[PDB]
Each structure stands twice: as C-alpha cells, then as structure tokens.
Write a protein that binds this ligand. Structure first.
Ligand SMILES: N=C(N)c1ccc(/C=N/NC(=O)c2cccnc2)cc1
Ligand SMILES: [Ca+2]
Length: 223
C-alpha cells in the first residue's frame, strides 16, 4: 500500500497473509474454512496466516492453518487477468473472535463514489521498494467504469473495477495482491493489477467480487 496508513493491530480481522515460507499475497476470510484471494496468487504449499499484524513477529493472536485445497476460477485468464479470483479451503476451521473474523460477501455490486478500505503488506513506495512488517490501510473511492476504461484502454472487463486516485500517490501495490477491498462492510474487490503503483492516471484495478458470489456459494456448498 502506497500513501496509506498503519491500520492498527487486528483492526482488519478478515485480512489474511498467504505464506509459502514468506508472505506473498493477501486474502480475505469469508467463513471459518474459506479464504478468497486472486487467482494470480495461486501456488501449492500455501499456509494461511490469520490474526496477523507484524508478519515477522509472533504477537499472540495468530492462527496458522495449511490450505487443503485451492480452486482457481474456471475462467481465469492469466494473460488478461480476467476472472482473477481463487478460493482456498483451510485444513481446519479457524476459531472466530474479534480479531479473526469473516467478511460478508456483497448481495449487490457497489457504485462509483463508494468509499472502500484496501489493506495489505505490499510495497509502500511508488518509485523504490520498501516492504512493511505491519498491516497498511488505504481509504479509496471506487472510480467510474468510464474513467477506469479511459485509464486502461482495451484492458478493463466487466469483471474489473478501478479504485483510488487519478492524481496518483495513493494505491495498492506488489505484495498486496489477493487482498481485500471492503466497502460498507462488504467484500467488493480483490487486489488484482495496475500499471506500476500510485502513478498518475493509473489507478488500481480490482476483481469485481459481486459477479462471483453465486460461484463462491455453490463452490463452498460442494467442497
Ligand atoms: N497499482 C496497483 N494497484 C497494483 C499494481 C500491481 C500489483 C501487482 N504487482 N505484482 C508484481 O509487480 C509482481 C509480482 C510477482 C512477480 N513479479 C511482479 C498489484 C496492485
Ligand atoms: Ca505476527
């Protein structure tokens, strides 16, 4: 997260870190046994780390649970990043409390202008590279589909939306991938892609979660 702020320990209780010997992506806990992330985060040997603040220090509220299975969206295209969504099932149910909690799925899509909270342990610099240890947060508005398409001609599908600031300076970034965009208490987005980070006229692009609620529910129901 570039141009954001320190969230505060466990203030984002649905935020997970996907770990394969090191943090490599974010994710969102959607019930005691399932995490939503980006398909581009797919890999084998994932351990899901819940209740994290400092990802380099055991602070007392963590739950580390191995993934038992991953399901990349059936229509994920790694070249276009269309349908950039994946489900991860935990080997055991997380113990849910104030600091480890699921986030509600949307029942309708969000509109341009809605404010959202975007969070992660990704790069904090738009030019250089600095990775934080504690969770970073950014409040950002959803942008109109027309401005999103104008920013990224030929690249924005009906399964994507832009959020952030066309002036630059405030954005998600590398390492935030797969993490949450939460708007009025609902998971509306997943950190997906962008050209650089916090660049002028290049806002963040997010997977449009409301399009996938049907697939998520039915997938969970049979797995
Ligand atoms: N501007 C955003 N909101 C944004 C931009 C980019 C990303 C993702 N980056 N990932 C990388 O660079 C990368 C990752 C692994 C290997 N090689 C390169 C997320 C958000
Ligand atoms: Ca920790």
């Amino acid at each position: 997260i570039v141009g954001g702020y320190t969230c505060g320990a466990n203030t984002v209780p649905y935020q997970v870190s996907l770990n394969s010997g090191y943090h490599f992506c974010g994710g969102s806990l959607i019930n005691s046994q399932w995490v939503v992330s980006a398909a581009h985060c797919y890999k084998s040997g994932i351990q899901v780390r819940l209740g994290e603040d400092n990802i380099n220090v055991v602070e007392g509220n963590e739950q580390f649970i191995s993934a038992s299975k991953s399901i990349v969206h059936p229509s994920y295209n790694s070249n276009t990043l269309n349908n950039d969504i994946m489900l991860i099932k935990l080997k055991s149910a997380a113990s849910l409390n104030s600091r480890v909690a699921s986030i509600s799925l949307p029942t309708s899509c969000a509109s341009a202008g809605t404010q959202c909270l975007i969070s992660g342990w990704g790069n904090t610099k738009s030019s250089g590279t600095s990775y934080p240890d504690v969770l970073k947060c950014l409040k950002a508005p959803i942008l109109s589909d027309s401005s999103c398409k104008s920013a990224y001609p030929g690249q924005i599908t009906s399964n994507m939306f832009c959020a952030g600031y066309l002036e630059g300076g405030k954005d998600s970034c590398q390492g935030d991938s797969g993490g949450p965009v939460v708007c009025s208490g609902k998971l509306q987005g997943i950190v997906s892609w962008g050209s650089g980070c916090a660049q002028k006229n290049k806002p963040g692009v997010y997977t449009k979660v409301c399009n996938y609620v049907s697939w998520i529910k039915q997938t969970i129901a049979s797995n």
